[PDB]
Write a protein that binds this ligand. Structure first.
Ligand SMILES: [Fe+2]
Ligand SMILES: [Fe+2]
Ligand SMILES: [Fe+2]
Ligand SMILES: [Fe+2]
Ligand SMILES: [Fe+2]
Ligand SMILES: [Fe+2]
Lengths: 464, 460
C-alpha cells in the first residue's frame, strides 16, 4: 500500500573514467613506483606497477585470448597479484627493522580498500576471456570425464636453449610467488564451516605445510632449490622478470580461493593439479638435474612425487564425491569449468615462456637484424611512427612489453637492453635491436646521456 | 606518475555506501526469530542505517548503543564473506542466496566501508589502552599476567538452563568456525614462526579428522542441550559484545599491520582458555547434569597448556629476535585491547541475563511508570504505532529507556532466547536501554505507544 521503508539497493557499479581513476588511485601508493634497479632487495612490500601508464589503458574493453599477452593484460596481472597479496603475511628475510614504513603502506586500510574496490573490474579484465574458451551433468558423466583425463613444451624450450642454465633459472623464478607461499591460495578455502569436505581439504593443506615443521614446509624446500642454482628466495626479488602468464596462473588460484562462489571451480582444479603434479614434478626433477648436474636440490619436486599420488585420490574420493552428494549435480559444471579453465591457462603459460626464451636467446641476432630493419624503414617499406628520446645515466625503464614490434635505434650513448634474467645487450651509437611484440623487456642508460629512437613498425618482417 | 589521491570516505558518501552494502536483499528483516539453515542471510536492519552518524566514533561509555550494535552486525557480515559456508541440508534450493553473498559486488561494497566501520567499532580502544619496551620488560610483563562473571550470571539466574543456552549461542560464530580467524595469519611467507602458528591451527582443526575438529565438538555441545548448530540460526540473539569479541580477531587477522597484536592476543587467549574451559565444564554440568556434552571444553583444558607455552616460546620470542623491540608495544596492545573487550562482554552478558530474568517484574513496573507519565513526572516523547499481524521487528536496542504500552491487540515481546512476554490491551513493559529485544504482532492489528522516558526511575 506504501513504499518500502528500506532504501532501494543501488547496484555496485564502477566503470569508465571513474574506474580508471580508482585504479590510478590504488597504484600511485609510493611502494608501487618504478624501481631504480632490476631487483627488489629483500623488500616484500615493493611491487612495480608502472603507475604512470595506467591512466592510458582502457579497462572496460575486455581482451579475448589472442590479446591477453598485450601490455594492458600484464599491467592488470601485476595489479591483481598486489591486491591478492595484501591478504598474505610477509616479512623481509633480514627482519622488519628499517622497513616498517613500507610494511605500513602495504598493510593499510586504504591500500586494501582501494585494491578491493577495483578487484571486480580487474578480474573481468584478467579472466573474462575464459568465458569464450571453455550444460547439465550427472555424477555418472563426471566420473567418465575424470577417468578420461613426449617432451613437454617447457622441456623443449629449456633443453634446446642457447643457454640451458639461464633458461632454467628464468623458469624457476616464475614459480617464486606460487611456491614460496605454497598452498596459501588453497588455505583460503578451509576458513569457515562446511561439511567433512573441509577437513579433507585441510589434510591436503597440512602436507603442503610440511606438517607444521619449517624444515619440511614445501616453500622451504623450494628456497633450497632456488639457492642451489644461485638464485635468491626473498619475495619479490625477481618481480620484473615475472612473465604475464606466470602471474595469470598464480592469480587464477587466488581468484578461485577468494571468491567462494567459485569454490566448486577450485575443487575441480584441485583434483586436476594434484593428480598432474606427479608427472610435472618427475619431469622437473629430471630436467633440472640434466641442466645443472648434481649441485641442484630437487627435493621440492621429488617430495611431491611421493605425496601427490595420494592427494589426487583424496580430491576425487573425499572432496568431489561427498560434495556432489551433498549439494547435487548442479555443482558439476563448475567442477568441470575449473579443470578446463586451468588447462587453458597452462597452454598460455607454455606459449608465453617458450616465446620469452626464444626471444632471450635470439638477442645477438636481433641486434644484427636492426640493420636491415632500419634500412627498410629509411626506404619507406613501412610508415612507422617514430619517437625521439633523451635520457640520463641510470634512467631505468622497468620491464614491460608492447603490442606491436618496435625498432630501437641508438644515436648517441650506451644502453643496457634487458630481455630476461641473465639476458642483456649493450647497445652503442649506431646500434639497436628489433623488439618483438608481447616480449618482456626494459632498459637502463649506462652512458651519461643516451639519445635514441623508437620506431613503431608493427610487424618487423614488413621492413625486410 | 599522477599524484596519489588518498583514500577518503566520510559524511553522506559513507552513509550512502553503508546503505548500499546493507540493502542486498539477503540482509533485510527476517519474518521469523530464527534463520532456518541458511548461512547467507544475516539481519542488518538496513532501514535504520541512513539515520546513524558513522563519523562520530563512540567512546567506551557508548559502545553498547544501537549504532555500535548495527556496526558490529555489518562487520560480522563483511568479514564472513571470506569464510566458506554451506547449509547443513546442502546447497540445493539456496543457490540464489549463495551467489548474493559470494559476489564481486557484495565483497567490494563491504570492503569499501570496512575502514570506516573498523574506526567506528574499535576506535575507542585508542583511549582505553596505553612508549618503548625491551625484551626483558616484556618478559616481566607476561610473568605478571572467586566466581567469574560468567559463573555469576548463569548460576545466579532465575532460569539457569535458559541463561546457559543464551550463553552458548553467543559462541556459535566463533566456535563453529573455530580457528578460522587465526588461519588468516598463516597465509604468506615468513619465518619459522609461521610453521609454529600453523602447528596450533592443526590442533584446533583436529589434524583434519572431522569428528575431532573443534567446531564439530562444539556442534555436539549445542545439540546436547537442544540447540541447533547451523549458522546463523540465532543471529538475532547475538549480543553486541559477543559480535565485538569475534570481530576483533577477524580485524587483527585481516589487517596484517596488526599481526603483532594478534601474536600477543594469541598468547593471552591460549593461556587463558585453560581456566575458562575448566569453569565452563563445571558450570555446564551443574546446570544440565549428565545430558550436556562438554568434550569441547575439556579438550582445551590440556591442549592449551601446550599452546600457551608455544605462543610465548616459539612465536613471541623468535619474532622479537627477528624484528626487534619495536614490535613489543603492539604485542602488549593486543593483550590489553582483548582484556578490555572481555570486560565489556562480561558486563553486556550479565546485563542481558538480568534483563531476561526480570521480564515479569518489568511487565508489572509498566503500571507505575505509565501512571507516572499520566501525571507530570516526566514529559517524554510519544510515538504512536499500528502494525499488522506478523510484522516482526527484528531485535535491536535503544539508547534510552522506553515504555511500551499496548492500547489494543496482542504483542509477543522478545527479550532473549527463550525469554518472551505476551502483552495484551492495557499492558506493557519497561524496555531497558541497551538491552537486546524485539517484538512480533500476534493479533490481526496491534495499536501501541512507545514513550521515550530516558530513565524509567524518574517516572516513579
Ligand atoms: Fe606442495
Ligand atoms: Fe599435494
Ligand atoms: Fe619498451
Ligand atoms: Fe580449539
Ligand atoms: Fe589452542
Ligand atoms: Fe524496540
Amino acid at each position: 500500500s506504501h513504499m518500502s521503508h528500506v532504501p532501494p539497493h543501488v547496484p555496485f557499479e564502477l566503470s569508465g573514467a571513474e574506474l580508471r581513476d580508482a585504479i590510478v588511485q590504488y597504484a600511485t601508493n609510493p611502494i608501487y613506483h618504478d624501481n631504480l634497479d632490476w631487483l627488489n632487495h629483500d623488500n616484500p612490500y615493493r611491487r612495480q606497477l608502472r603507475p604512470q601508464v595506467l591512466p592510458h589503458l582502457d579497462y572496460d574493453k575486455v581482451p579475448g585470448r589472442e590479446n591477453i599477452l598485450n601490455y594492458a593484460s600484464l599491467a592488470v596481472q601485476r595489479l591483481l597479484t598486489s591486491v591478492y597479496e595484501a591478504d598474505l603475511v610477509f616479512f623481509p628475510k633480514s627482519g622488519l627493522k628499517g622497513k616498517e614504513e613500507d610494511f605500513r603502506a602495504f598493510y593499510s586500510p586504504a591500500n586494501r580498500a582501494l585494491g578491493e574496490r577495483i578487484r571486480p573490474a580487474l578480474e573481468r579484465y584478467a579472466f573474462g576471456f575464459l568465458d569464450d574458451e571453455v550444460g547439465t551433468w550427472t555424477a555418472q558423466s563426471l566420473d567418465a570425464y575424470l577417468d578420461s583425463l613426449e617432451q613437454s613444451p617447457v622441456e623443449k624450450a629449456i633443453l634446446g636453449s642457447a643457454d640451458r642454465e639461464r633458461a632454467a633459472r628464468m623458469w624457476l623464478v616464475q614459480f617464486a610467488p606460487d611456491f614460496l607461499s605454497e598452498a596459501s591460495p588453497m588455505m583460503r578455502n578451509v576458513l569457515g564451516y562446511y561439511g567433512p569436505a573441509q577437513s579433507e581439504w585441510f589434510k591436503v593443506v597440512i602436507d603442503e605445510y610440511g606438517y607444521g615443521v619449517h624444515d619440511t614446509k614445501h616453500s622451504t624446500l623450494f628456497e633450497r632449490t632456488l639457492e642451489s642454482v644461485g638464485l635468491e628466495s626473498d619475495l619479490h626479488r625477481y618481480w620484473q622478470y615475472y612473465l604475464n602468464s606466470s602471474l595469470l596462473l598464480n592469480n587464477y588460484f587466488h581468484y578461485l580461493g577468494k571468491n567462494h562462489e567459485l569454490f566448486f571451480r577450485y575443487v575441480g582444479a584441485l583434483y586436476y593439479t594434484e593428480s598432474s603434479l606427479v608427472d610435472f614434478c618427475r619431469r622437473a626433477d629430471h630436467l633440472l638435474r640434466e641442466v645443472f648436474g648434481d649441485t641442484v636440490d630437487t627435493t621440492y619436486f621429488t617430495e611431491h612425487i611421493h605425496i601427490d599420488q595420494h592427494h589426487g585420490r583424496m580430491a576425487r574420493e573425499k572432496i568431489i564425491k561427498p560434495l556432489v552428494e551433498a549439494h547435487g549435480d548442479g555443482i558439476i559444471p563448475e567442477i568441470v569449468r575449473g579443470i578446463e579453465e586451468y588447462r587453458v591457462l597452462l597452454e598460455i603459460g607454455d606459449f608465453d615462456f617458450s616465446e620469452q626464451i626464444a626471444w632471450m636467446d635470439a638477442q645477438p641476432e636481433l641486434k644484427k637484424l636492426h640493420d636491415p630493419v632500419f634500412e627498410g624503414l629509411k626506404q619507406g617499406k613501412v610508415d612507422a611512427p617514430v619517437a625521439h628520446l633523451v635520457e640520463p645515466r641510470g634512467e631505468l625503464s622497468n620491464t614491460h612489453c608492447h603490442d606491436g614490434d618496435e625498432l630501437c635505434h641508438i644515436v648517441s650513448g650506451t644502453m643496457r637492453f634487458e630481455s630476461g634474467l641473465g639476458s642483456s645487450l649493450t647497445l652503442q651509437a649506431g646500434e639497436g635491436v628489433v623488439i618483438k611484440r608481447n616480449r618482456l623487456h626494459g632498459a637502463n642508460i649506462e652512458s651519461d646521456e643516451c639519445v635514441y629512437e623508437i620506431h613503431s613498425v608493427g610487424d618487423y618482417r614488413k621492413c625486410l
